[PDB]
Amino acid sequence: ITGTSTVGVGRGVLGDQKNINTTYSTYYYLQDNTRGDGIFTYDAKYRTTLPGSLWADADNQFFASYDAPAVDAHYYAGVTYDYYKNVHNRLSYDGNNAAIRSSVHYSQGYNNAFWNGSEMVYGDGDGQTFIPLSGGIDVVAHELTHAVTDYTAGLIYQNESGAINEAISDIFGTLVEFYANKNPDWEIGEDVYTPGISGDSLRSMSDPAKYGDPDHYSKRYTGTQDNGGVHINSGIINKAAYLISQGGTHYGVSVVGIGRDKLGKIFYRALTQYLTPTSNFSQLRAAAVQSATDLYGSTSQEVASVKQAFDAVGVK
Ligand SMILES: CC(C)C[C@H](NP(=O)(O)O)C(N)=O
Ligand SMILES: [Ca+2]
Ligand SMILES: [Ca+2]
Ligand SMILES: [Ca+2]
Ligand SMILES: [Ca+2]
Ligand SMILES: [Zn+2]
Incomplete structure (x- = not known):
C-alpha cells in the first residue's frame, strides 16, 4: 500500500x-x-x-x-x-x-x-x-x-539439526521476551497456553523435565515422531543455554553463569558464522566454544562456562 x-x-x-x-x-x-x-x-x-x-x-x-x-x-x-x-x-x-x-x-x-x-x-x-x-x-x-x-x-528440520533449530528459536524468543521486559521468564508460551491453568507453559528451558522433555543427552528421544523429536530434544540445548546464562549444578556438574547478553552474543555468532544445515549437538558445542573464544579469549570464564554447560547435559 x-x-x-x-x-x-x-x-x-x-x-x-x-x-x-x-x-x-x-x-x-x-x-x-x-x-x-x-x-x-x-x-x-x-x-x-x-x-x-x-x-x-x-x-x-x-x-x-x-x-x-x-x-x-x-x-x-x-x-x-x-x-x-x-x-x-x-x-x-x-x-x-x-x-x-x-x-x-x-x-x-x-x-x-x-x-x-x-x-x-x-x-x-x-x-x-x-x-x-x-x-x-x-x-x-x-x-x-x-x-x-x-x-x-x-538447519534441516529433522533429528539433531532440527532440535538445534527449535532450541535457537526458543533461546531467542526468550531473549526477546527479556528485551521487552514483558514479565520475562525461561518458559515458553506461558501467556497463551491453557487459559484455565495457571503457572504452566508449553516447554520449560529452566527445567525441561517438568513437562517430560529430556534435560540430558542420555535421555534423548530416538524415535520418529515430531520429525525425530525436534520439539522434544530441543530441551537438552535449552537447558544448556539456561545454565550458561544463569548458572547452577546439574547432574553434579557446576556452571558459573555469564548472563543473558553474553549468551545471546555467543549463540548469534555460532548461528551466523559456524553452524551448517546438518550440524549436530556435538557440532553446536564446538561452534559455541569457538564463538565464545573469538569473543572473550580462550582462557575466558565465558569459554569455561560454555564447556561446563555442555558437559552438564551430556554433550560431549
Ligand atoms: C512456540 C509454539 C506456540 C509454536 C511452535 N510452532 P513451530 O512449527 O514454529 O515449531 C511449536 N510447536 O513449538
Ligand atoms: Ca477500528
Ligand atoms: Ca513471560
Ligand atoms: Ca516465556
Ligand atoms: Ca496456562
Ligand atoms: Zn519452532
Whole structure:
C-alpha cells in the first residue's frame, strides 16, 4: 500500500493497550513503514489460504475482539525487528531489511503458529488449549527466528539439526521476551497456553523435565515422531543455554553463569558464522566454544562456562 504513515491504538489478546504503526490510504492498514521494508499484517478470515487480505480498518482504532491477534502480531513483530537490529545489528530476518509478513485468524480453532518459508501464521487456538497465539511475545520471536535460521545456518528440520533449530528459536524468543521486559521468564508460551491453568507453559528451558522433555543427552528421544523429536530434544540445548546464562549444578556438574547478553552474543555468532544445515549437538558445542573464544579469549570464564554447560547435559 502507498499512503501516509500514522499511528493507531489497539488492545492486544491480553487486554493491554498499545500504539501500532499503520498506513493511511482511504482505510488505515496494518502496514508499518518505519522498519526496514515494512511490517505487514493480514486477515486470513478463518481460512487456510495465505496470506489473506492486508488488514484494513476504518478509523485507526483496534479495540474489537476480532482486532486483538492482529494488533499483537503486528506490534510484537516490530519489537523482534528492533531486538535484532539494536542488539545484533541485523536488519530484518535476511539481513537486508526484507518485509515481514504475518497472517492471523488462520483456520478454525488452530492450536499452533508457524513460519511457512515465507511468512508467519497464527491460529486463534481452540480457547482452551490456547488463546490466539500472537498474544505471546516469545511465540512471535520463536517464529521470526525460524526465518533468521533459515537465512543463516539453514538447519534441516529433522533429528539433531532440527532440535538445534527449535532450541535457537526458543533461546531467542526468550531473549526477546527479556528485551521487552514483558514479565520475562525461561518458559515458553506461558501467556497463551491453557487459559484455565495457571503457572504452566508449553516447554520449560529452566527445567525441561517438568513437562517430560529430556534435560540430558542420555535421555534423548530416538524415535520418529515430531520429525525425530525436534520439539522434544530441543530441551537438552535449552537447558544448556539456561545454565550458561544463569548458572547452577546439574547432574553434579557446576556452571558459573555469564548472563543473558553474553549468551545471546555467543549463540548469534555460532548461528551466523559456524553452524551448517546438518550440524549436530556435538557440532553446536564446538561452534559455541569457538564463538565464545573469538569473543572473550580462550582462557575466558565465558569459554569455561560454555564447556561446563555442555558437559552438564551430556554433550560431549
Ligand atoms: C512456540 C509454539 C506456540 C509454536 C511452535 N510452532 P513451530 O512449527 O514454529 O515449531 C511449536 N510447536 O513449538
Ligand atoms: Ca477500528
Ligand atoms: Ca513471560
Ligand atoms: Ca516465556
Ligand atoms: Ca496456562
Ligand atoms: Zn519452532
